[PDB]
Amino acid sequence: TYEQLYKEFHSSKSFQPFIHLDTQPKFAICGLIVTLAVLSSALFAVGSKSSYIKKLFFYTILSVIGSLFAGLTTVFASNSFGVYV
Amino acid sequence: QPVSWPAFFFDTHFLIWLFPAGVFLLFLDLKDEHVFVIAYSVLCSYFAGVMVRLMLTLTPVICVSAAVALSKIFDIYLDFKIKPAALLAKLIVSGSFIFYLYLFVFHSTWVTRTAYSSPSVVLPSQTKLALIDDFREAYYWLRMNSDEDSKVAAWWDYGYQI
Amino acid sequence: SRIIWATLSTFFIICMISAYMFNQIRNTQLAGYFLPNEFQHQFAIETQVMVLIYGTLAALVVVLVKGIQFLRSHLYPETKKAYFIDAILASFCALFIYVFFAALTTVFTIKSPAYPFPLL
Amino acid sequence: DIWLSHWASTIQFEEYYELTNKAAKLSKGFSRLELMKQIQTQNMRQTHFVTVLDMLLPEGATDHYFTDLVGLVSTSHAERDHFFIRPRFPIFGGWNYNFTVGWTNKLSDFLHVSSGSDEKFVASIPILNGPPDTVYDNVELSVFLPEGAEIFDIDSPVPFTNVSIETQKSYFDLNKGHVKLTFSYRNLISQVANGQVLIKYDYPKSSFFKKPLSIACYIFTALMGVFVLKTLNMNV
Amino acid sequence: SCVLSVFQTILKLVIFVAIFGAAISSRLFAVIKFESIIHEFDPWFNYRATKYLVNNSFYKF
Amino acid sequence: MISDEQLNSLAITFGIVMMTLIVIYHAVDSTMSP
Ligand SMILES: CCCCC/C=C\C/C=C\CCCCCCCC(=O)O[C@H](COC(=O)CCCCCCCCCCCCCCC)COP(=O)([O-])OCC[N+](C)(C)C
Ligand SMILES: CCCCC/C=C\C/C=C\CCCCCCCC(=O)O[C@H](COC(=O)CCCCCCCCCCCCCCC)COP(=O)([O-])OCC[N+](C)(C)C
Ligand SMILES: *[C@@H]1O[C@H](CO)[C@@H](O[C@@H]2O[C@H](CO)[C@@H](O[C@@H]3O[C@H](CO)[C@@H](O)[C@H](O)[C@@H]3O)[C@H](O)[C@H]2NC(C)=O)[C@H](O)[C@H]1NC(C)=O
Ligand SMILES: *[C@@H]1O[C@H](CO)[C@@H](O[C@@H]2O[C@H](CO)[C@@H](O)[C@H](O)[C@H]2NC(C)=O)[C@H](O)[C@H]1NC(C)=O
């Protein structure tokens, strides 16, 4: 019903955003420093020398952390340059 | 189509006079690798002497030979492992070539911004800083207001853009 | 030998990047040194002047690399101040690089009249 | 095509017009001399051809653009609430012109959170923005909800010809993609069809954070792919 | 070469980031000033041939 | 979008950071190599 959805529309709150667009490139830069420090220190855990199981362990936990900071960073840096989502 | 020397200074700032000294410095310890750089310098320097689009194959060997001469100078004048006279001389000879490396950036960005960054479609003749897009106006008239199998006989140097 | 082929091929490079064949193909004439405010065209002694310029900066580069141990002994017989004399001599070689490179960008400034880095 | 976006909190309008001028055609062809003298004589009264278009946009519109097929057009003027447009050639009687305009509104005034559930949104979209004197022979209104949205209810004030729900992959749509809810209206008037399309959907936070987690899944499997290609011995 | 190789590897990587930034950002004086469009009379056919490749098959290209 | 003077400042600062860290790499390499 268009009238039920019209009443249900005009009696509602507005969209309160999660993170605004004007603070979001700063999250992109700080997130780039975080995931670049974590992933930049992740290729040297496989890089220098170790055993195998500790190299696998620290590589996979540090690659999980740097990978999720990388994904959230490129969402915010996607929204910063003009394209959205 | 021969070319004059201000295109040689214009396209490469200070690499044009490290280009021969790199070759002469690549003779004095002549491995089998360096015969390629010498022949690729002597040959393609002739071809860019005769033509103008053969400057484009000359451009990499100017960078390689300038990079071997400048790293020989920086090789024997960044050895910081003493005495204040030699240290003062090493700073006054390294700090000159660092200054040319910084001048190369401002030259290479001024030349790019002025002489090689312009559209071939928008024609800013300023008949006032006015832009002119009569080519896209007319060609988009042909795209919009003509039957899609009409044949357009223009002169040949505008043949692709149509 | 090796140095003679080096000097012949390097001098060939000097004569080619100083645009000798624009003076060979396009028959140019001399009037009175340079063509001011005219980028494309060339006088026939400008090739000779630029051979002097490019040749002397390349010569100062190779003196500045493999010419410092040879001129600290040929020009001064003593050995007690080797670092002092060859240090000063390398510094003067850098100074002549700066002078002749200013004598390159000055000539390019009188060729192309609006050049914002004349280095003088 | 409109594009709802919960991460940017913005709605993004893009419109593709294929307009003709059904006025009287002009005899003796077209001559720029008579047109330019007709401009230089007086005042540009009311006549047939099209020189400028007045696009009436929603209230706060930010990033205006106006392109043709071959490139962009620089003769456009985006003043407050009004987007003026000059095409490349003046559209005389019978001539065609296909162009594209676009702008960007904030989402806080087109989208409204429902009351019963926090993760259920209701959007009301302006059905038609354009010049004040136009008649639309075909309209297809594609609204694009984000990747995890699920449409519950659909209401339109104008009786449409068609409606369908598809998906379409835009930038960083690693999974199935945006939910393309597309309406097909046939015969509309610019002045008459004052309406808003009401979509009621949900968009839970389980699917709101799956975008950076999906991009994190590709970066993670790429780097474990790097680990397999560096613990592997190939030395003959 | 205990610590030195790591520091020279990091310097080499930051060097190629600066080289790619200088080698991309110095090209874009005509795209950012006017528009991204194909220039200078010849690559309109290369662009139309690439459009033919991406709309149709490679066997048809 | 970025302007043209700001792109000129971006291109020049990538050039200066580029040549600066090249010279730093060559100094650290030429001092501490056998
Ligand atoms: C290798 C490490 C990362 C390397 C990073 C390299 C470069 C980043 C630096 C600068 C680039 C940003 C400049 C954007 C220019 C304006 C955009 C535009 O205007 O063009 C866009 C093209 O969109 C793009 O391409 C997206 C570019 C996104 C770049 C953001 C950074 C992400 C980098 C990727 C990281 C790895 C990915 C992993 C995925 C699994 C045209 O959009 P449209 O015509 O459809 O407009 C209408 C839009 N509707 C359709 C919504 C209405
Ligand atoms: C190989 C390494 C590559 C090195 C660099 C390569 C290319 C650089 C050359 C040119 C770039 C110039 C940009 C031209 C376009 C202008 C747009 C513009 O300037 O955006 C500016 C702001 O931007 C910024 O704050 C930049 C934010 C931080 C940048 C982060 C870097 C991206 C990389 C992240 C990838 C992480 C994943 C890791 C994967 C391992 C705004 O513009 P607007 O008003 O149009 O936005 C539309 C209006 N809102 C604001 C409402 C939306
Ligand atoms: C710009 O938009 C206009 C408006 O839609 C497009 O015009 C349409 O183009 C198609 C194909 O060129 C025409 O179909 C033709 O119909 C005639 C009979 O009417 C037939 O003889 C042809 O074989 C073809 O099927 C269509 O009539 C025409 N519409 C109008 C109102 O003229 C135009 O193609 C678009 N141009 C570009 C460059 O996208
Ligand atoms: C109503 O819209 C649907 C879209 O779902 C149309 O169906 C598509 O029609 C195209 C023809 O151009 C086919 O290629 C697709 O396969 C169809 N999709 C489906 C799911 O059927 C349909 O034709 C439209 N009907 C009318 C009367 O406009």
Side-chain angles (χ1 to χ4, degrees), chain A, chain B residues 1-80 82-125 130-162, chain C, chain D residues 1-42 44-236, chain E, chain F:
Chain A
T1 302
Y2 183 79
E3 183 65 29
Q4 292 179 355
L5 195 37
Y6 185 79
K7 291 179 182 179
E8 198 271 333
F9 175 75
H10 285 283
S11 67
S12 292
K13 274 76 68 177
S14 295
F15 178 70
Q16 296 293 322
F18 185 74
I19 293 169
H20 297 86
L21 285 172
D22 55 357
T23 67
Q24 201 166 3
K26 293 184 283 186
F27 286 100
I29 297 169
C30 296
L32 186 144
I33 295 170
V34 169
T35 191
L36 193 63
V38 172
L39 291 181
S40 180
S41 177
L43 295 176
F44 290 103
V46 71
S48 297
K49 277 181 188 296
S50 181
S51 294
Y52 182 72
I53 191 66
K54 303 300 291 294
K55 179 173 71 177
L56 177 63
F57 182 75
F58 286 102
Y59 187 81
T60 194
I61 185 169
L62 203 62
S63 178
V64 163
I65 298 300
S67 179
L68 59 89
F69 279 101
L72 185 142
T73 299
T74 186
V75 171
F76 291 161
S78 179
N79 294 115
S80 172
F81 285 108
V83 302
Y84 302 114
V85 173
Chain B
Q1 293 178 356
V3 72
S4 63
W5 65 271
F8 288 104
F9 183 78
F10 189 73
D11 291 331
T12 54
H13 175 72
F14 78 110
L15 309 180
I16 195 64
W17 57 267
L18 290 176
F19 170 66
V23 173
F24 189 83
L25 275 174
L26 277 181
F27 273 93
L28 298 176
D29 48 355
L30 184 58
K31 268 66 184 298
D32 54 353
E33 306 166 0
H34 308 298
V35 183
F36 189 76
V37 187
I38 293 165
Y40 176 50
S41 296
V42 172
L43 189 62
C44 193
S45 180
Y46 177 79
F47 285 109
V50 178
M51 296 297 291
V52 296
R53 67 182 179 179
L54 275 307
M55 184 66 203
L56 187 63
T57 60
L58 183 64
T59 306
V61 73
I62 301 173
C63 297
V64 174
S65 69
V68 70
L70 193 35
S71 70
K72 284 178 181 179
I73 294 171
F74 283 169
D75 193 5
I76 61 170
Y77 291 105
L78 270 301
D79 291 333
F80 287 155
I82 301 169
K83 291 181 181 179
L87 186 281
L88 186 281
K90 282 161 66 179
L91 290 179
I92 204 168
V93 72
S94 176
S96 181
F97 285 93
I98 297 167
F99 173 71
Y100 301 120
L101 291 175
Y102 286 160
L103 188 63
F104 178 70
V105 174
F106 288 94
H107 177 82
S108 297
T109 309
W110 178 75
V111 170
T112 300
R113 186 184 180 184
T114 297
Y116 296 111
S117 293
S118 177
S120 178
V121 180
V122 178
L123 194 287
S125 67
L131 68 51
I132 293 168
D133 57 354
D134 292 333
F135 292 99
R136 288 184 295 173
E137 182 179 0
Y139 295 161
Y140 195 62
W141 189 81
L142 259 59
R143 191 168 185 173
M144 297 308 297
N145 299 121
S146 67
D147 49 349
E148 65 180 0
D149 56 355
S150 66
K151 285 86 185 177
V152 180
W155 185 243
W156 63 268
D157 53 358
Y158 299 102
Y160 278 162
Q161 283 187 346
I162 295 169
Chain C
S1 179
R2 182 176 291 174
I3 303 169
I4 183 166
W5 289 98
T7 303
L8 287 175
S9 66
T10 303
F11 181 74
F12 182 75
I13 286 172
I14 295 295
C15 287
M16 287 299 169
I17 66 172
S18 173
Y20 180 73
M21 296 186 74
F22 186 77
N23 296 116
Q24 195 272 332
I25 296 170
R26 299 288 187 269
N27 287 319
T28 60
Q29 55 90 31
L30 284 319
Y33 291 98
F34 293 99
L35 280 171
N37 201 0
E38 187 173 1
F39 183 80
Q40 188 64 255
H41 295 282
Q42 185 180 1
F43 279 172
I45 60 170
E46 307 178 359
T47 303
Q48 297 178 356
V49 174
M50 291 299 107
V51 165
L52 293 177
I53 296 298
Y54 290 160
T56 196
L57 277 96
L60 286 167
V61 170
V62 70
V63 164
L64 196 144
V65 180
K66 293 181 180 180
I68 298 300
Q69 302 292 321
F70 178 74
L71 286 175
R72 64 100 178 266
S73 178
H74 180 76
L75 196 34
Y76 293 97
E78 64 184 1
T79 316
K80 186 266 298 296
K81 293 191 288 184
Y83 65 96
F84 187 75
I85 276 92
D86 71 357
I88 291 172
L89 186 60
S91 176
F92 284 160
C93 188
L95 191 145
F96 284 111
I97 287 176
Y98 185 77
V99 171
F100 281 102
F101 183 70
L104 180 61
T105 61
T106 302
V107 174
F108 185 73
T109 302
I110 205 167
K111 182 70 75 175
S112 175
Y115 182 71
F117 302 102
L119 191 282
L120 190 35
Chain D
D1 301 329
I2 79 162
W3 297 90
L4 278 75
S5 175
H6 288 284
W7 279 94
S9 70
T10 195
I11 183 168
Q12 189 176 5
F13 292 93
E14 183 180 3
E15 293 182 350
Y16 177 68
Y17 291 93
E18 293 183 354
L19 68 84
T20 71
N21 185 0
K22 59 160 62 171
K25 295 179 182 180
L26 73 165
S27 64
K28 285 90 169 65
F30 168 72
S31 67
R32 177 69 65 186
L33 181 62
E34 187 180 2
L35 175 62
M36 188 182 70
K37 184 171 71 69
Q38 192 270 330
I39 292 172
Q40 289 182 357
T41 176
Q42 66 265 15
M44 188 63 200
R45 295 184 294 112
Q46 197 58 40
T47 181
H48 302 163
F49 57 93
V50 184
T51 303
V52 67
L53 291 172
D54 190 1
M55 293 290 175
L56 183 63
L57 276 51
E59 184 176 1
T62 302
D63 288 328
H64 299 90
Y65 65 95
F66 165 60
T67 62
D68 287 337
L69 294 174
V70 287
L72 71 51
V73 184
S74 64
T75 62
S76 68
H77 185 272
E79 74 179 8
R80 79 287 176 275
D81 197 74
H82 289 282
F83 181 59
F84 291 101
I85 282 171
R86 296 176 64 89
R88 284 176 181 160
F89 52 89
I91 303 160
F92 283 88
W95 289 0
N96 289 102
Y97 192 73
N98 306 340
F99 64 96
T100 303
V101 304
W103 64 96
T104 301
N105 291 111
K106 59 177 68 66
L107 189 59
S108 298
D109 55 353
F110 294 96
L111 188 67
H112 282 78
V113 180
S114 68
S115 297
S117 178
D118 195 2
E119 304 299 326
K120 287 183 181 180
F121 299 95
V122 174
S124 77
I125 304 306
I127 197 167
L128 189 61
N129 296 116
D133 192 0
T134 51
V135 184
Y136 295 89
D137 282 343
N138 291 115
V139 175
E140 53 184 2
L141 175 66
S142 298
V143 307
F144 284 94
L145 281 55
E147 198 178 11
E150 295 177 355
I151 298 169
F152 284 108
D153 193 72
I154 295 166
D155 284 323
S156 177
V158 177
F160 52 87
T161 303
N162 197 356
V163 63
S164 66
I165 300 168
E166 295 179 354
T167 59
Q168 179 170 355
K169 291 185 180 181
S170 287
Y171 299 96
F172 298 101
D173 285 332
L174 279 65
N175 293 320
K176 296 183 289 293
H178 282 83
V179 177
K180 180 173 74 175
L181 173 61
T182 172
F183 298 94
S184 295
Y185 297 99
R186 190 174 64 248
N187 211 161
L188 292 175
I189 308 297
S190 178
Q191 190 178 4
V192 174
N194 299 116
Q196 290 178 353
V197 178
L198 274 72
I199 297 98
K200 183 174 184 178
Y201 66 99
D202 59 351
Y203 189 70
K205 293 184 288 293
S206 177
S207 296
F208 173 72
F209 292 109
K210 196 181 286 293
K211 180 68 70 178
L213 193 146
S214 66
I215 303 169
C217 183
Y218 276 4
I219 299 298
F220 176 69
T221 192
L223 292 175
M224 294 299 289
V226 172
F227 182 74
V228 174
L229 272 72
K230 285 186 179 181
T231 188
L232 198 38
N233 193 358
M234 47 92 70
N235 289 114
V236 291
Chain E
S1 66
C2 182
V3 185
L4 185 64
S5 179
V6 174
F7 178 71
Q8 288 179 355
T9 303
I10 298 300
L11 281 181
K12 192 181 290 183
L13 190 144
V14 177
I15 274 301
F16 281 105
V17 172
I19 286 172
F20 292 166
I24 292 168
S25 64
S26 180
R27 265 71 171 172
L28 301 175
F29 286 103
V31 165
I32 288 172
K33 185 174 174 65
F34 294 99
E35 197 194 0
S36 68
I37 196 170
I38 287 94
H39 301 289
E40 290 295 328
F41 285 162
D42 195 79
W44 289 102
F45 183 73
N46 299 323
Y47 172 67
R48 191 169 71 88
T50 307
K51 285 172 69 176
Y52 191 82
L53 204 166
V54 301
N55 291 319
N56 287 311
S57 178
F58 178 68
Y59 174 72
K60 291 191 286 291
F61 171 68
Chain F
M1 192 176 286
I2 193 167
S3 67
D4 188 72
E5 290 291 328
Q6 188 173 359
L7 183 67
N8 193 5
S9 296
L10 188 64
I12 290 173
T13 194
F14 274 114
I16 298 299
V17 169
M18 179 181 72
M19 290 297 174
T20 299
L21 293 172
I22 284 168
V23 171
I24 292 170
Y25 181 80
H26 197 93
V28 174
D29 195 4
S30 293
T31 299
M32 295 179 185
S33 177

